[PDB]
Design a protein around this nucleic acid. Structure first.
Ligand SMILES: Nc1ncnc2c1ncn2[C@@H]1O[C@H](COP(=O)(O)OP(=O)(O)O)[C@@H](O)[C@H]1O
Ligand SMILES: Nc1ncnc2c1ncn2[C@@H]1O[C@H](COP(=O)(O)OP(=O)(O)O)[C@@H](O)[C@H]1O
Ligand SMILES: Nc1ncnc2c1ncn2[C@@H]1O[C@H](COP(=O)(O)OP(=O)(O)O)[C@@H](O)[C@H]1O
Ligand SMILES: Nc1ncnc2c1ncn2[C@@H]1O[C@H](COP(=O)(O)OP(=O)(O)O)[C@@H](O)[C@H]1O
Ligand SMILES: Nc1ncnc2c1ncn2[C@@H]1O[C@H](COP(=O)(O)OP(=O)(O)O)[C@@H](O)[C@H]1O
Lengths: 362, 362, 362, 362, 362
DNA sequence: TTTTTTT
């Protein structure tokens, strides 16, 4: 009998696998007998136990084959081909809707019967995130719409505040909610060349902790990031296509993606201040610090950094009609799921605990 | 049965794909039944629904095949071969006539029944651009004439002026009309060679926002760009061929393209001013600035940066005889469309609105 | 029924193609029917209409083939193989005699019944070049002997003088007459390897617009050229075989070509001054500018740079006996055309016009 | 009806080709019929008229074949394989004996009645060059003896002296008398990897114009060469096998060959100074230059640089027993044949003409 | 029939052949008949006449084969693979056994029937070193066993003395008895990290001429070398694995090799003094200089500075039963050779005349 | 792999 190359390519497509060694290893685990597989019976990894039943007959023949890495390469090139087709043909609203579909799939497993996580612990995360800024759910929705519409010169937001105020916490959650990357522009103009190359085909970027110079009475390290941003003005404005470089690969011409700049209270040049739409001032708050000392599980599970928490915030607060037409069905299912388990009185009691600096789940 | 490699090569020539991954992704999705195909029913992308019914039989057999990327690589070689043949054998008037034909195909789709845009928005763009410089249609035409003749020494145009003065708006629109690339020569010398390699076979080059030295006299940043340009003087003149390189590929010998330099008001060494045949001064105009803020659809849809707008300007103002004899019959059809859907009073009112800082549609 | 690889090899040999993409593109055009081809009926490019009828049957079999680039790579290597054989086996007099035959073939097509060139406009170029230096045909003939005899350490010529004085003009014309490559040595030492590799198997090199270190008090830019070139002294002499390099290919060992160095009034080290035979000083001549300004057809058609203009000068002034024995019989045919289509007096009027700063033709 | 790969390998062994494009070009010329072959009738090159009649039948079938470059690779590999066998298994005296046999075969054909050269002008070469130094012919013998012994850590020679002093013409003459390759180590140390790779299985290495640090006040610019050699100490000592590299081929483990360094008057670090066995320093002379001005055939025909001129000198001054025993019978034929024409009285007269600066002839 | 690839691999294994083109070249020699072979009758090399009778049948088929280099590549990979199995097991004793095997075989040649120098020069040098330092025949055997055991903290020996005392000249011979490299730790601390990386995967390290501070009190130059070395605590002691990096490579983790420090007479901080297991003081002796001056061939043949002189000393004095139980048989022959080629009394005569300051062969 | 990256 012969290997079906078509069944391998299907598995790669449905697993969304970019990687020749990961695919090869995953697929070789299907050769052992289905009826007695310990990895199925512990139900431990979803990308195994959902597929082993189908692929056993092909995996047995594949284990005898001589072509193995050649079969996996064609499968991986098919998955890479779809990504490139999508990048050039989807509108930004569809890219975001696909990303929410990926997140909702992970939530269904994570809060399912074999799930590890309590939904009570993640709703405590929504209560703590809501106290970080005024009107958080509007701020998150304004951010999403701004990244979708991508209007020239209305592309970037500035996060400003003392050390330990929440800047990296909120930024990391937005990066997970709509996939993106972090950049470090504090380097010399020499090395920036490959640093800016991380943004190739990304939806969103964050410039993390850019350092100015001067203001030394404030007790701040000096660096050159603000000078660099002032020379990188064209990338922030975004009217024109710029050349971007990865190590060993040819230059690509792109409209550089929108993003977030985080900084301490360094002085902005009047030039740079004008490229931003909004600045959000973060300030330290004593009640939130006392709360985290008495609700450690938020930090230790990394709940407050995670985009699943921001999505649960959006699901609770925003009306169904703001979401795109195809995802609305999953959302009304998830709303009814949540309203059945959290009474509004319990959620207001969670928020009242956070405002008092007491532990959330008393 | 066996795959027809000839039909794949035919598809690549009709859609003009250079990317092997993009061609592979496109061709695979034809494998599903044409009678049901959702993107054909939705009329989503012209690169798909115009072809699916023809290629369906071959795409099913291609999905079974074991040398898919060898098939796609040969098809991409075939499209590259036509580009190099056309580059050595066509006169620059024919190269430009072919670029106008591509744009007019986009305009037929874009302003047809399937398309999203409409003419009164984009024609207000042509009214806005005409207020930027005196006699804009003569300046655009005289530029096109210069680039087609490509006379040595008498070859490059210099745009200078304060920030927010429309240099990059015009330069990006001229770039989109002719086709070409933007280069950032502000770099260190040891990596300029790969930057200049982006010019290979292009029709235009635009050297964007080159920094000088001595800017503190004006409160301007400092950078090497103007000194690098003084070392590249051989590339600007175009008297003799230069050697250009892409990463991992052997050097190619050709005459460097003509084009545009944009800069802030640095002092220019007189040996470089001797090499620029025309200098166009841009200055702040407050009425243009007020008009954009009240007419922001001009930015949100990128109407003012786009070469389709400049071609509509040429169609409105130029007499039919100045286009090459091949494309004239297609242009009189467009003059008829525009003179049907508009009147002089409508366009005279749009320019009247701009000149008073009123909204262009008021 | 199978492709004959020998027919493609003949076509490549008769056409002299060095790159695989160009050979592939040319040959794929032959698959369409000979009885209707528009490119044959217009007689537009001579590489097509002379060969299509012979190759058509094979081209349709080539278009079905699974192996196309492999076929073309063998054919291109066969053309490169002949050029390597001749570079070891021929004397330099025969190399130049062959290059003159190639030029005289182009002159038959340019000035034939089926081409655009006007012999009066090209003989107007001879008048302008004959004014640039005194005794111009003596200079051209002494240059040619220097390149043919290739006497060690007496091989290079130096051109000095202001910007806009005819030095790059005459260098480009000599470079087309002999054939060769133009090289840039103003970049730093560490990437010169692949630049000097452009000189492999060539007859001439021209080092364009070399920059010195000093002279800044004259308002002349500083750079690395003369420092680099003083390290390269071993390449200039041609007493010893050097090692030359291209990407992915092994070291070639050969004597480096003779050539021309061009520069703008920098001072030169005594070690470099010892390795040039003759220095030519160019000083601006006002009447040549006012002539050229009224004679813009010279620049558009590039006549004053073209090697054909110096070959026409040699046919006008030199005796017949001092061309090689096989090419004399074609030169005497060209002597007769020029004495039929011009008198002396029409040529003497043109040369008087150039002295007067009037347009060359009147 | 198959191509004989055996016959191609025999042609490469008899011609001793070591480049694939050259062998391909040479073998393809044999496909045309033997009878009418214009090159065989004129007898232009021995590598053609010796072999065509034998190889014709195989070359016609080679011209139909489609593996052509793989056939030539296996033939060139066979020739490179034999040189490595010789390089290990021959006695080092016999390698020099073999190289003289190659020269003595080549010297006989060029002084044949069919040859272009003549005895008196090449003996003027012997006269001029023996005048260049004190006791020249015994200095050449001392060099040959030193290289033949190759006593570890007692190999290399220095030369030192200024421009136009004579060092490089002597080094070039020795290089052709032996087998050898010139190297340029003035480039930065990390690039030298493939430069040193040329010495693989060579007899002599010569380092030409190696530059020190400082001394620039004499108009002798600096470079990395001497610091490189002090790093490359392990290769001069060569008491152990070094590892030498070339592109896409398995690397060679070998002792680096004996050789010569030529320099201008730089300082030498004591660590490097200790490696060189002998230091034959140079001084300029004036009547020799007066003679060359009047005797231009010497440089035109490259008489003074060639190893044939030193071999004519060693034939002149050396006793016949000092050579190897196989060539002893050839050397008496050249001793006699040379004396039979060129008597000592006329030799002394023209040697006086050099000494007096007259110009050598009569 | 077909080629046996295993017969080729047997020849490569038994010849211990490391290199593809060398294997190809030697195996092709077996094409011709065994009975007639001229090399077999002369017996010039063992690698031919031992095998030709056996391998002739295969070599007749190998000559017709169309993929000869692939056969040889597999054979060489088989010999190279066996060296990496042996790397698994090498105890540091067995490293020194085979390091000696490589050096005796070069002694067998150089002093042999086909030799190049006579032991009467070498033995007077061995007698000279046997009076440079007290009891030195015991020192070298003790030194080597410290290196073989590589006991932590017991690793390093300090050679101290004023200039011209014998330090560098003995360090050369010990480094050539072992294998290793020298390091120059006088560099500023920034550059030391790359210098130390040269020790990657080696048996021995030698540190040369560490500059102190305060040595100007005796006109000694001063520098950081001692202060750098005092800070390399973990590299000297050898209890823990340390990181090493070459330029352009990733960091390697290993125990740092043992070694020798040679020092120009400065003071040593008592921290650094605790790192060295034994200190050797070298002192000027004028009778050693008079001896050298009256025996200058000792230096000019470089008798003193070789691992050959130290191995020859280990042969003379030490007993046989302490050499490894395999290699000890090869010292039987060099003992009996020396005991008969040289006189037990003549040694004492030349040590006497050395100590007398008389010429060592007088 | 070589080149590019690294230095
Ligand atoms: N608004 C706040 N008030 C008090 N503590 C905070 C606040 N936001 C965050 N923290 C504390 O600071 C830690 C780090 O927050 P992060 O956002 O990573 O720092 P930064 O604001 O400097 O980027 C959190 O884990 C939490 O313990
Ligand atoms: N005459 C003008 N006066 C003031 N602003 C202008 C004028 N023309 C264009 N603009 C502004 O130019 C902006 C485009 O950027 P641009 O000025 O071209 O950048 P740069 O000057 O760096 O090339 C537009 O967003 C618009 O607001
Ligand atoms: N006699 C002259 N006076 C002024 N300009 C001249 C003269 N001769 C040639 N030129 C100019 O030389 C230009 C070409 O450059 P050229 O002077 O040959 O080299 P470079 O600019 O490097 O010195 C032509 O476009 C032409 O305008
Ligand atoms: N005595 C001499 N007479 C004439 N020319 C000489 C003499 N010595 C050297 N040369 C010139 O220098 C070249 C090589 O000698 P060398 O002293 O090495 O010069 P360079 O230092 O320029 O290489 C010769 O080929 C020749 O052109
Ligand atoms: N103990 C000694 N007494 C006198 N001269 C010596 C002594 N040791 C070496 N020499 C001489 O000193 C020269 C330099 O030796 P070297 O090892 O460079 O000195 P150092 O001990 O400073 O390293 C030797 O070549 C030798 O001629």
């Amino acid at each position: 009998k012969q290997v079906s190359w078509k069944l391998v390519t299907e598995y790669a497509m449905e697993t969304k696998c970019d990687d020749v060694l990961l695919l090869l290893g995953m697929y070789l685990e299907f050769q052992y007998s289905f009826e007695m597989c310990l990895k199925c019976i512990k139900k431990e990894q979803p990308s195994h136990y959902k597929y082993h039943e189908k692929h056993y007959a092909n995996a047995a023949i594949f284990a005898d084959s001589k072509n193995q890495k050649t079969i996996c390469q064609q499968a991986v090139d098919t998955v890479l081909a779809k990504k490139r087709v999508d990048s050039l043909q989807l509108t930004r609203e569809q890219m975001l809707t696909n990303r929410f579909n990926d997140l909702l799939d992970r939530m269904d497993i994570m809060f399912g019967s074999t799930g590890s996580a309590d939904i009570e612990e993640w709703m405590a995360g929504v209560a703590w995130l809501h106290c970080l800024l005024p009107k958080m759910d509007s701020v998150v929705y304004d951010f999403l719409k701004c990244m979708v519409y991508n209007i020239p010169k209305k592309r970037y937001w500035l996060f400003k505040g003392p050390i330990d105020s929440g800047k990296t916490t909120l930024a990391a959650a937005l990066l997970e909610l709509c996939g993106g990357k972090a950049l470090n522009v504090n380097l010399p103009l020499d090395r920036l060349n490959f640093e800016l190359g991380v943004a190739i085909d990304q939806f969103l970027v964050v410039f993390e902790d850019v350092k100015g110079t001067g203001g030394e009475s404030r007790d701040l390290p000096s660096g050159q990031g603000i000078n660099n941003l002032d020379n990188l003005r064209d990338y922030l404005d975004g009217s024109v296509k710029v050349n971007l470089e990865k190590k060993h690969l040819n230059k690509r011409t792109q409209i550089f993606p929108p993003g977030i700049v985080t900084m301490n209270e360094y002085s902005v040049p009047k030039t740079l201040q004008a490229r931003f739409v909004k600045q959000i001032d973060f300030r330290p708050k004593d009640y939130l610090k006392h709360c985290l000392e008495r609700s450690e599980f938020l930090l230790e599970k990394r709940i407050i950094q995670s985009g699943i928490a921001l999505l649960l915030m959006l699901i609770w607060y925003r009306p169904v009609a703001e979401f795109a037409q195809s995802i609305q069905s999953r959302i009304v299912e998830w709303k009814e799921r949540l309203d059945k388990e959290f009474s509004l009185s319990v959620y207001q009691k969670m928020k009242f605990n956070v405002a008092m600096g007491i532990g959330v789940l008393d």
